[PDB]
């Protein structure tokens, strides 16, 4: 039950360091309007780390097509968040969604969210 944990006091940020360090880190890629993947972030390249031209392309695949696609575009059109989906190949829920950067009005461009374990 309760044996002894002195560090538990001084180590108040410790528990936060593990939580804050966690974060999302679901790849940072920007797609002009559609899924135009021709620009990768310096941080996004660190994840994969292979080539400078290859990292540019070879992305956006699990977008999932539907009838009422216009309903999806509404998410990016307006500065509104997005929900994630669980398409898990092996206990690794995959959520491919396009969210728009926060702003105070008109917003252009869209970000591509991808979850790949490698």
UniProtKB/Swiss-Prot annotation:
PAS domain location: 5-116
Location of the protein in the cell: Cell inner membrane
PTM note: Autophosphorylated. The phosphoryl group is rapidly transferred to DcuR.
Top-level taxon of the source organism: Bacteria
Outcome (variant: residue 97 to D): Causes constitutive active state of the kinase, leading to constitutive expression of a target gene, without addition of C4-dicarboxylates
Other observations noted: The region encompassing approximately residues 42 to 181 has been shown to be periplasmic, however exactly which residues are periplasmic is not clear.
UniProt domain comment: The periplasmic domain is involved in C4-dicarboxylate binding and sensing. The structural disorder in the cytoplasmic PAS domain has an important role in signal transduction to the kinase domain and may be the decisive structural feature that characterizes the activated kinase.
Subunit description: Homodimer. Interacts with DctA and DcuB. DctA/DcuS and DcuB/DcuS complexes are present both in the absence or presence of fumarate.
Entry function: Member of the two-component regulatory system DcuR/DcuS. Involved in the C4-dicarboxylate-stimulated regulation of the genes encoding the anaerobic fumarate respiratory system (frdABCD; nuoAN; dcuB; sdhCDAB; etc.). Weakly regulates the aerobic C4-dicarboxylate transporter dctA. Activates DcuR by phosphorylation.
Record-given protein name: Sensor histidine kinase DcuS
Parent-protein start and end of this portion: 211 to 325 of 543
């Amino acid at each position: 039950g309760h044996m002894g944990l002195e560090p538990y006091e001084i180590s108040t940020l410790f528990e936060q360091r593990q939580a804050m360090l966690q974060s999302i880190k679901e790849g940072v890629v920007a797609v002009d309007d559609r899924g135009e993947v021709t620009l990768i972030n310096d941080a996004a390249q660190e994840l994969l780390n292979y080539r400078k031209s290859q990292d540019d392309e070879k992305l956006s695949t699990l977008s999932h097509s539907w009838s009422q696609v216009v309903d999806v575009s509404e998410v990016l059109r307006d500065g509104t968040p997005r929900r994630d989906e669980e398409i898990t190949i092996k206990d690794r829920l995959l959520l491919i969604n396009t969210v728009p950067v926060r702003s105070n009005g008109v917003i252009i461009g869209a970000i591509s969210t991808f979850r790949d374990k490698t």
